[PDB]
């Protein structure tokens, strides 16, 4: 990467000003005479003892162990930006009541629970408590900074009109940066603020640049740096074996997060946020557990939108296809080599000279009869629709985006026309709700010509990525909808593009069919619109190792549909690295292979025979586990717990799993340690849990945790383990795609706990329609194993789905010889089931239950 192209903290004028303030007595002190306890919120006025300009602090309890507080200014002068469309709803309120009052402090219990907020007055310092235990202190070190609207002057350099490299930023409002620090006692481990190419556990930025949250088109980004990548979610989860909190800093501007920790008595982690503008909007998630803060945050921003089933499969992308012929041959090469492929993905060259919403009459002469033979083989197609619109008299999009003023406008008031690849490209105001309504209308089957129901849309470079812009983005003085500057609305722009495209793909069917959209840039609450992937990464072994932490960190903030580019994007991989990337990618939520112009063709069937059947096995494993993926994506859709989750999420008290980013958990069942080394002869897998058994998914060999086992590996081995006490559904009949697989018999792999118990869930739906919600045509089944009985019940009684899926096989791992296996059902005679028991692996295969998944049944191991 070219580091002399993006701003460090010293080159960002506000960051070098906020960071200049150092821990000391806070000049901001609360005046407990304007302390006004309304029915919803407490309002107090803080004064700056030197500046003598008073801000307004609004404290608010929330009904889910939660506290939102907003620091704005009493007399605004110019209203500051408050981020919309991120919260899925107005949070419910848990009222505050004075538990006690002092000449310097006020303690406020939240509703009637164990939480009390202690607000001191000299200096201002919020102190959240649970009964008598400190949880986190706000402004404990005296780093509350709120730069008010200065009088028009254009002192310190950069506080006004500035130039980064050659691009002017004439700030008409001067310094409006905000900042605040939170001290978390007892926490040494902090996670979140995703899209940083670093480890999952954030590092202390005491002698280096802080973590930047700025949607940037970083070309060929490196790793293990705090540089801002394509996305930004300002959520920070703290972890302890006893208590786990979270800090949600709602600000759509450029944000820097400084992580600090004491050396030294009780451990403590201090997290400092500095935003360029807006107000200080902080949600505090008081746990007390990992599952609780995920549910709280999902109640704030929203849950991961349930994807269609085909998007859970394999997507193949080259750097575009030269014509319809190349798409037809790639489909035929997936069919001929019996590889399971779901979606074929088209890049920018498919557009009419980088002009989206249309196809070239010579490059793709018959666009809608290409999807017809893609739907005959039951596969999907994904195009590219990026925000920037080319300038033409013949471009209907540009002739309507300029007639109806919906473009972003520069400082003087003319339309932004940054030179992107589509010629001179005008960037539209995706902040404008009336433009997102125009954007959504143009994905219809009449507007988008050559469009079919199997045609979906991927919005690349929605940061926005302006080629002739400061860094690689739009100028910060660009005027957006509502009079807001682009400086206020940067990180929300990608979320707005994603939302508009998702509602465009939703409403073409009429709202019936689920929309799959993939975005590079995003914000908090972008889990509700589609998938996000970790930008353009090089094809090296280090970028494959870091694939897991960037998806684990993304899953922590609700974006559980994460993935990286299989085979990289730059510096075309060796065959071994391409093989190992297809094995990891099969166990990430998003599984897409993408290529570049500089790279050759990396299709799976132009590889060595040993390197092609291994990949074919890797795709078969993912498609077989697709029922597990669909169930896991439903859990993320309901309770917000990530699909790809770390090891300390399920084992909070294990102080060994805190710094683990090479293994992950696909829910509570599967532990995955994909191999990322050149010629690795073995992996070192940490199997956690006191009194837990883990079965090798291939060899069915049980290991007792907590331990660190050396698993020797070959090129054919993906180290996946099943936790003893889980039931994993599978489709063992792998077809060409997931379109007839959705009606194929289910097999249940039952791994027994040391107490002989097991539990699992299975979610079923038509896989492509919003019918599981409006008419409740879904089916959530709970499979339990206790004693010697495997019972199937409904985990949601209102889910009534009529499916042809039956149970064709039951695999009980860790069982014994039954000598009799019976199946009981709805009054029908107890039909005895045949069984084969392998004694070396201790695996009992119950043959052909032959029973529909909808009906309840009980297998008795008599």
């Amino acid at each position: 990467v070219d580091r002399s192209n993006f701003k460090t903290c010293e080159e960002s004028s506000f960051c070098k000003r906020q960071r200049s303030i150092r821990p000391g007595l806070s000049p901001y002190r609360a005046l407990l005479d304007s302390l006004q306890l309304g029915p919803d919120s407490l309002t107090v006025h803080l004064i700056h003892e030197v500046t003598k300009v008073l801000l307004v602090l609004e404290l608010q309890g929330l009904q889910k162990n939660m506290t939102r507080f907003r620091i704005d200014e009493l007399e605004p002068r110019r209203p500051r930006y408050r981020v919309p469309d991120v919260l899925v709803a107005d949070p419910p309120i848990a009222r505050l009541s004075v538990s006690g009052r002092d000449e310097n402090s006020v303690e406020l219990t939240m509703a009637e629970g164990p939480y009390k907020i202690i607000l001191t007055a000299r200096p201002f310092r919020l102190d959240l408590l649970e009964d008598r235990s400190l949880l986190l202190s706000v402004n404990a070190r005296g780093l509350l900074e709120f730069e008010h609207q200065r009088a028009p002057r254009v002192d310190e350099p950069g506080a006004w009109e500035e130039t980064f490299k050659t691009h002017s930023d004439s700030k008409p409002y001067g310094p409006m940066s905000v900042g605040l620090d939170f001290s978390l006692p007892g926490m040494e481990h902090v996670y979140g603020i995703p899209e940083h190419a670093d480890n999952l556990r954030l590092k202390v930025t005491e002698g280096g640049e802080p973590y930047r949250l700025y949607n940037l088109d970083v070309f060929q980004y490196e790793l293990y740096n705090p540089m801002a990548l394509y996305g930004s979610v300002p959520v920070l989860l703290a972890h302890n074996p006893h208590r786990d909190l979270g800090i949600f800093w709602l600000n759509a501007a450029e944000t820097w997060v400084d992580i600090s920790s004491n050396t030294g008595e009780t451990p403590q982690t201090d997290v400092r946020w500095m935003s360029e503008t807006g107000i200080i909007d902080v949600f505090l998630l008081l746990g007390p557990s990992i599952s609780d803060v995920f549910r709280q945050y999902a109640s704030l921003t929203g849950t991961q939108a349930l994807p269609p089933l085909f998007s859970l499969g394999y997507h193949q992308s080259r750097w575009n296809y030269r014509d319809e012929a190349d798409v037809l041959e790639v489909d035929q090469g997936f069919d001929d080599h019996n590889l399971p492929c779901d979606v074929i993905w088209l890049d920018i060259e498919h557009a009419d000279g980088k002009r989206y919403f249309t196809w070239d009459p010579s490059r793709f002469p018959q666009p809608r009869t290409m999807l017809e033979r893609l739907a005959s083989k039951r596969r999907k197609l994904v195009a590219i629709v990026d925000p920037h619109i080319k300038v033409d008299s013949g471009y209907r999009v540009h002739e309507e985006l300029r007639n109806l003023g919906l473009y972003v406008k520069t400082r003087d008031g003319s339309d932004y026309e940054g030179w992107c690849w589509p010629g001179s490209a005008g960037y539209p105001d995706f902040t404008n709700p009336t433009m997102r309504a125009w954007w959504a209308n143009m994905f219809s089957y009449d507007n988008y010509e050559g469009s079919a129901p199997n045609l979906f849309v991927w919005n690349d470079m929605n940061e926005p990525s302006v080629f002739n812009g400061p860094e690689v983005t739009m100028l910060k003085d660009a005027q957006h909808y509502g009079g807001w500057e682009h400086r206020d609305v940067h990180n929300i722009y990608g979320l707005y593009v994603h939302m508009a495209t998702a509602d465009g793909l939703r409403q073409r069917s009429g709202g019936m069919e689920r929309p799959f959209v993939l975005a590079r840039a995003f914000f908090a609450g972008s889990q509700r619109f589609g998938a996000v992937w970790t930008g353009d990464n090089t094809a090296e072994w280090d970028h494959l190792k870091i694939s897991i932490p960037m998806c684990l960190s993304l899953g922590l903030v609700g974006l559980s549909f994460c993935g990286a580019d299989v085979g990289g994007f730059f510096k075309n991989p060796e065959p071994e690295l391409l093989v190992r990337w297809y094995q990891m990618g099969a166990y990430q939520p998003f599984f897409r292979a993408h290529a570049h112009l500089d790279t050759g063709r990396r299709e799976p069937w132009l590889l060595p025979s040993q390197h092609n059947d291994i990949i074919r096995d890797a795709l078969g494993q993912r498609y077989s586990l697709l029922p597990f993926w669909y169930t896991l994506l439903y859990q993320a859709h309901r309770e917000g717990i990530p699909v790809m989750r770390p090891l300390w999420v399920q084992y909070p008290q294990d102080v060994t799993t805190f710094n683990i980013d090479d293994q992950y958990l696909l829910g509570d069942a599967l532990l995955v340690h994909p191999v990322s080394d050149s010629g690795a002869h073995g992996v070192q897998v940490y199997l956690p849990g006191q009194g837990e058994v883990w079965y090798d998914i291939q060899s069915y060999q049980k290991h007792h945790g907590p331990q660190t086992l050396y698993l020797p590996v070959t090129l054919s081995s993906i180290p996946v383990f099943q936790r003893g006490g889980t039931i994993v559904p599978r489709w063992m009949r792998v077809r060409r795609s997931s379109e007839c697989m959705k009606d194929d018999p289910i097999t249940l792999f039952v791994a027994l706990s040391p107490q002989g118990t097991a539990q699992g869930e299975l979610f079923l739906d038509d896989g492509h329609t919003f019918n599981y919600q409006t008419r409740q045509e879904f089916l959530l089944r709970r499979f339990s194993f206790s004693g010697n009985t495997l019972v199937s019940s409904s985990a949601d009684p209102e889910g009534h789905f009529e499916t042809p899926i039956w149970i064709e096989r039951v695999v009980i791992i860790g069982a014994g010889k039954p000598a009799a296996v019976v199946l009981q059902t709805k009054g029908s005679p107890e039909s005895r089931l045949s069984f084969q028991h392998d004694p070396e692996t201790s695996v009992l295969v119950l043959r052909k239950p032959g029973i529909n998944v909808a009906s309840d049944w009980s297998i008795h191991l008599r």
Binding site: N338, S376, K377, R378, M732, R733, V734, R735, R736, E739, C740, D744, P745, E808, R809, R847, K848
Partner: protein, 100 residues
Amino acid sequence: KRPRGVSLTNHHFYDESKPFTCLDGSATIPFDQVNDDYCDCKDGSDEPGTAACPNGSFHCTNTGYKPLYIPSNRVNDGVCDCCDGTDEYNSGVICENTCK
């Protein structure tokens, strides 16, 4: 009266009267288990006509076109692989006799 998915060459190894053998040799199965939609045989022999085997094949005899052994995963998949679509019979998708 050959079982589904079997060529005339493959039709004498399958006998209705006798228990079916794995056709390569692992174990014998009752004939009710041939084409029963379950992978009784490791070879995949028991299910020539169904997609129940990860290793089986469907022989498609075409009048006027070369007989072809499609993979077993292509049977009942909603796509008409064979010229005479005998591969789809219970999938709800009907094919045409394109054997010209």
